[PDB]
Amino acid sequence: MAQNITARIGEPLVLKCKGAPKKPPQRLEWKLNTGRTEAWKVLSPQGGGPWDSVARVLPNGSLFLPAVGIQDEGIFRCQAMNRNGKETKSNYRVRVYQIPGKPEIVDSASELTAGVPNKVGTCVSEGSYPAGTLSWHLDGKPLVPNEKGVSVKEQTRRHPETGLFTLQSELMVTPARGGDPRPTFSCSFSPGLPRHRALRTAPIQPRVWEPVPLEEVQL
Ligand SMILES: [Zn+2]
Ligand SMILES: [Zn+2]
Ligand SMILES: [Zn+2]
Ligand SMILES: [Zn+2]
């Protein structure tokens, strides 16, 4: 019954109060349950204020947020007396997002040694909401973090001062012998919200070194 609204952090949002008369006077009230304050907050025509933000009731009865943020996630309800005579209800659920910058691979290896585990590099994404995920490719094909000789260590960290996230994914591989000598790797960031294109790193191409042994004793 509650309509889902998706809004990008930073951007304005207008929510319609269904059945409100087009202009004042209006009998309507907005009630909001959002962010980290537990109590419903009540707004009515005015409506009023800020600036610089936040929520105001417009002349047409709509709710206006000048720049949406994480603290605006939650429930937005309107009740309005129709023109005339009975009441119309509106009920929205608002979620928000931020697309982070292009992902980057830090500390990439120039060379890998076949037959032992190697740190390929760490993929970092900065500034997403909600967190979303990172994943790797080897020559354009998906790496599963659990398959033979691939392992991934991942970190999600939330900035307590902005609510945005930093993701890290450190790829470790153990190359089999012969063995393409110049494999390519890259990482993609997949947003949690919205239904959005992944963001991909520039590829790295370490060389695979195979040290040749003839150095063990017949016991
Ligand atoms: Zn409580
Ligand atoms: Zn580094
Ligand atoms: Zn892929
Ligand atoms: Zn986009």
From Swiss-Prot:
Sorted alphabetically, which keywords does the UniProt record give?
Cell membrane, Cell projection, Disulfide bond, DNA damage, DNA repair, DNA replication, DNA-binding, Endosome, Glycoprotein, Immunoglobulin domain, Inflammatory response, Membrane, Nucleus, Phagocytosis, Phosphoprotein, Receptor, Repeat, RNA-binding, Secreted, Signal, Transmembrane, Transmembrane helix, Ubl conjugation
Q: Per its UniProt entry, which superkingdom is the organism in? A: Eukaryota
Task: Cite the Ig-like V-type domain residue spans from the record.
Answer: 2-95
Q: Which residues are glycosylated?
A: N4, N60
All disulfide bonds of the chain are: C17-C78, C123-C187
In the induction comment, the record states: Induced in T cells by antigen stimulation and by the S100B ligand. Induced in trophoblasts by DNA damage.
Tell me what PTMs the record reports for this protein.
Phosphorylated on its cytoplasmic domain by PKCzeta/PRKCZ upon ligand binding. Phosphorylated by ATM following DNA damage.
* Membrane-topology annotation of the record: Single-pass type I membrane protein
Q: How does it assemble?
A: Constitutive homodimer; disulfide-linked. Forms homooligomers. Interacts with S100A1 and APP. Interacts with S100B, S100A12 and S100A14. Interacts with TIRAP. Interacts with HMGB1. Interacts with LGP2; this interaction plays an important role in AGER-mediated pro-inflammatory responses and cytokine release. Interacts with double-strand break repair protein MRE11 which is a core component of the MRN complex. The interaction enhances MRE11 endonuclease activity and promotes DNA repair.
Functional note: Cell surface pattern recognition receptor that senses endogenous stress signals with a broad ligand repertoire including advanced glycation end products, S100 proteins, high-mobility group box 1 protein/HMGB1, amyloid beta/APP oligomers, nucleic acids, histones, phospholipids and glycosaminoglycans. Advanced glycosylation end products are nonenzymatically glycosylated proteins which accumulate in vascular tissue in aging and at an accelerated rate in diabetes.
The name this protein goes by in its record: Advanced glycosylation end product-specific receptor
Look up and give the organism this protein is from: Homo sapiens
Covered range within the whole protein? Answer: 23 to 240 of 404
